Amino acid sequence: WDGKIDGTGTHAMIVTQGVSILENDLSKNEPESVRKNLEILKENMHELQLGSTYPDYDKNAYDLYQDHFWDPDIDNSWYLAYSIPDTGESQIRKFSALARYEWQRGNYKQATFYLGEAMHYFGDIDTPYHPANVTAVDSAGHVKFETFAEERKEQYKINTAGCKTNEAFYTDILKNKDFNAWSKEYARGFAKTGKSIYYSHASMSHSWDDWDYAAKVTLANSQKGTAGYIYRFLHDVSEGNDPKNVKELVAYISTSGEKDAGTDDYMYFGIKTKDGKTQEWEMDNPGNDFMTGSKDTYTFKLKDENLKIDDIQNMWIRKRKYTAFPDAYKPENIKIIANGKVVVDKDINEWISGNSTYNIK
Ligand SMILES: [Ca+2]
Ligand SMILES: [Zn+2]
């Protein structure tokens, strides 16, 4: 969907309605804590709206908004040595992890921003063009549609999911104790309806009164869906809800803003287990990794499927010199996420030059 940096436009309308919907649908057999936190969230609506639009303006190693797409329909030896690429689904899981982390420890303003960011991605897999994986290159309808829907966003608003917090839609959301598990499938459902509406109503072929129907559905879905996620979120952070085997690791690396803090040198993330076995992946996204000031996301696929978090005794990033050109690197902070829970939050702000191997755990 379209979004403007000041937190306005289709994306902001979706989160804004998502909240307003959760109010109108909120059950009476609903805990004091949940009702209280939703107040906190409304207290930070501006940040929820800003996070909802922002991912379209983040300078990443994703030169092309790659992480904003996802084929809900679609592993191997290669990814034991390389970082896996993120998706619209993947990002929901990551920002929801950050949102929960900040909340549990007090920063509600930034927690709410992160949560709004997660919802940017969900809104996107609820577009017709992103789940169908049709880029603005792939087809001229991507942009013309998202814009058609921009100019009309208002007339597609919805006040309710249709159920109540006691009813069906909202109780399945809570049914599954594993967030990451629930989120993938929840999101898959909505995203699947997207691919479908592309082919039938919202493609460049399919018509103009076809596009009106197309936007109505997907924007309404984006609202009912966004409300679901927020609801889930509100519950998850009132009980200290806590999502097992570590099969993946997500590293969210914030690079410093100071000049020449970025590196065009090779970067690796690695671990050593309690036993003594080790794995290293190259941190390598589509575009330019580790630019000055960017915040990058690397997902890592463990070779030992049956591993638990405490068994991972060590964690480090490692530089290897690209040339004789001195790209020394300054990480501002790095978070490691394992199963929807942040598990490392090392601030750094040191310089790494040469082939140094900084340890973070
Ligand atoms: Ca590359
Ligand atoms: Zn969008």
From Swiss-Prot:
It catalyses: a 1,2-diacyl-sn-glycero-3-phosphocholine + H2O = phosphocholine + a 1,2-diacyl-sn-glycerol + H(+). GO terms for cellular component: extracellular region. Its EC number is 3.1.4.3. Residues 247-361 form the PLAT domain. Ca(2+) 2 binds at D284, N285, G287, D289. Its cofactor is Ca(2+); Zn(2+). One of its GO terms (biological process) is hemolysis in another organism. Pfam families: PLAT (PF01477), Zn_dep_PLPC (PF00882). It comes from the Bacteria. CDD domains: PLAT, ZnPC_S1P1. Zn(2+) 3 binds at D56, H68, H120, D124. The protein is composed of 2 domains; the N-terminal domain contains the phospholipase C active site (PLC), in a cleft which is also occupied by the 3 zinc ions. The C-terminal domain is a putative phospholipid-recognition domain, which shows structural homology with phospholipid-binding C2-like domains from a range of eukaryotic proteins. The ability to bind membrane phospholipids in a Ca(2+) dependent manner and toxicity is conferred by this C-terminal domain, which also contributes to the sphingomyelinase activity. Two main forms of alpha-toxin can be purified from C.perfringens; a major form with a pI of 5.48, and a minor form with a pI of 5.6. Both are equally active. Variations seen in PLC activity between different strains may be due to transcriptional regulation. This is Phospholipase C.
